[PDB]
Design a protein around this ligand. Structure first.
Ligand SMILES: Cc1cc2nc3c(=O)[nH]c(=O)nc-3n(C[C@H](O)[C@H](O)[C@H](O)COP(=O)(O)OP(=O)(O)OC[C@H]3O[C@@H](n4cnc5c(N)ncnc54)[C@H](O)[C@@H]3O)c2cc1C
Ligand SMILES: CC[C@H](C)C(=O)C(=O)O
Ligand SMILES: [Mn+2]
Length: 454
């Protein structure tokens, strides 16, 4: 990367906000995945959208790859600079604006985390529900198409992103639904917002997200329920969903995950467990609990172990399940699977996955959003090239089993570097060419986070 180019970057954002230092680049060359660190040639912190546009235009016209960087909590190598280039850390743009409580909407810049937003909204009676375990950038969550434990009731990022401000690869500024617009529904033209949700930084740089806010629940009850087997817990899950109980949260942990979480945080019985949460009025809760306890009882579930601070403890342990797993073998890294299948096929694949983890030398824990037909296998890897090949082969086989059942290889994490072949199988030749034609019209030179997704 030439000295003239670095000085041009410094001319846009200021000398303090450009770094070519080795350690700074290394810190921005990886996320939380096992994908090997690949340092960008420089890291740049734009201070406003004009600077984002001018950095993008400078890189694009000079043939320099651009890697958008939020909080670096992704798990598929999205920020890995496989072709070098300029990593654009967006987190100094950290303002909440256009809070419209009467309309249930707000605009956030990339440095705003869900934590920061919900802190800002305390006493408003509103909250933002999409809750990945990590303290992630909300714009990063829009970029990956994130979901979380609350999604079964309150929707994913795709459900809750109403508008996006995007700096396109050559620097042009796009407001996907129109500048300043926010509304409940539209048929006006082609929906551009949904194209950029889940684009992972390969179609442009998200510099603000307009989010749907939700009313805080009238009352909240959380509980855990222990089961004799994986089959019993997942059958209960499917039957709760088919009974249309509007559960707020329904999270599965197998016995391995439960023990890991116990050890890293809880003293739940070591068993396949559902973490449950219900929202409503006092009477609406009693109805929901009654119908849900009946279904769990039919499948051998324990009487509910009930959970303010205790509920926060419960969900904090769930949100840290990734780190609880890693702690089973210190020094190791991890790869998460993320398949999502038609709910009626969830019992087969989860039970089969549990059986396949037992039959192998791999250490794996199972956790996730079974209310969506989605789950994660957290596979530990010693950074033992043979173990890492066995983990990667396990992940691909599980992905292909999900595709065989009519499902998808990723419910929320994305494709990044890890699932590019699975995506080709998932949508076929015409799906791939169509996605690539979309990529090519927005990023003709292929400089917008190259090597990812497609
Ligand atoms: C402990 C833990 C728990 C997690 N739990 C969940 C979970 O429940 N659900 C879930 O969906 N994910 C989960 N994640 C994954 C991760 O938190 C999400 O994928 C999150 O959305 C990533 O945001 P980020 O800004 O940290 O991403 P980064 O790693 O910074 O970037 C991710 C990708 O998006 C691109 N990108 C980032 N910001 C922008 C932007 N502003 N514009 C354009 N492209 C951008 C990057 O180029 C990259 O390809 C978890 C991660 C951890 C470590
Ligand atoms: C980082 C992957 C993790 C297992 C996750 O997505 C979750 O906590 O639901
Ligand atoms: Mn998850």
């Amino acid at each position: 990367l030439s000295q003239d180019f670095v000085e041009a970057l410094k001319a846009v954002v200021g000398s303090p906000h450009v770094s070519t230092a080795s350690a700074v680049r290394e810190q921005h060359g990886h996320d939380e995945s096992m994908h090997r660190c690949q340092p960008p040639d420089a890291v740049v912190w734009p201070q406003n959208v004009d600077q984002v546009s001018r950095v993008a235009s400078l890189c694009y016209n000079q043939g320099v790859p651009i890697i958008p960087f939020g909080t670096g909590t992704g798990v598929e190598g999205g920020v890995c600079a496989v072709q070098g280039g300029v990593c654009i850390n967006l987190t100094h743009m950290d303002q909440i604006t256009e809070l419209n409580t009467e309309d249930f909407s707000v605009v956030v810049e990339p440095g705003v985390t869900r934590k920061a937003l919900n802190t800002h909204l305390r006493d408003s009676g509103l909250w933002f529900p999409v809750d990945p375990g990590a303290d992630a950038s909300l714009c990063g969550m829009a970029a990956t198409g994130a979901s979380g434990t609350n999604a079964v009731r309150y929707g994913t990022m795709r459900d809750n992103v109403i508008n996006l401000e995007v700096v396109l690869p050559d620097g042009r500024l796009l407001h996907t639904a129109g500048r300043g617009r926010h509304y409940r529904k539209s048929a006006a033209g082609y929906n551009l917002t949904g194209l950029f949700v889940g684009s992972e930084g390969t179609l442009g740089i998200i510099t603000s997200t307009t989010l749907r806010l939700h009313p805080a629940p009238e009352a909240t009850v959380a509980a855990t329920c222990a089961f004799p087997s994986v089959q019993a817990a997942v059958d209960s899950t499917v039957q709760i969903l088919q009974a249309a109980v509007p559960v707020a949260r329904i999270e599965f942990l197998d016995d391995v995950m439960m023990d890991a979480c116990n050890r890293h945080s809880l003293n739940c019985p070591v068993a396949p467990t559902l973490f449950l949460e219900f929202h409503g009025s006092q009477q609406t809760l009693a109805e929901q609990l009654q119908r849900t306890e009946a279904i769990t009882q039919d499948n051998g579930g324990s009487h509910f172990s009930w959970a303010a601070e205790k509920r926060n403890e419960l969900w904090a342990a769930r949100h840290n399940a990734w780190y609880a797993a890693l702690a089973l073998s210190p020094g190791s890294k991890a790869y998460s699977t993320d398949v999502c299948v038609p709910i009626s096929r969830l019992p087969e694949i989860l039970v089969e996955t549990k059986e396949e983890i037992k039959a192998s030398k791999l250490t794996g824990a199972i956790v996730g959003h079974v209310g969506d037909g989605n789950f994660h296998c957290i596979l530990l890897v010693d950074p033992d090239a043979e173990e890492q090949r066995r983990v990667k082969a396990f992940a691909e086989n599980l992905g292909r089993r999900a595709l065989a059942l009519g499902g998808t290889c990723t419910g929320e994490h994305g494709i990044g570097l890890g699932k590019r072949q699975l995506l080709q199988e998932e949508v076929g030749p015409v799906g791939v060419e169509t996605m690539r034609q979309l990529k090519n019209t927005l990023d003709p030179r292929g400089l917008m986070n190259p090597g990812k997704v497609l």
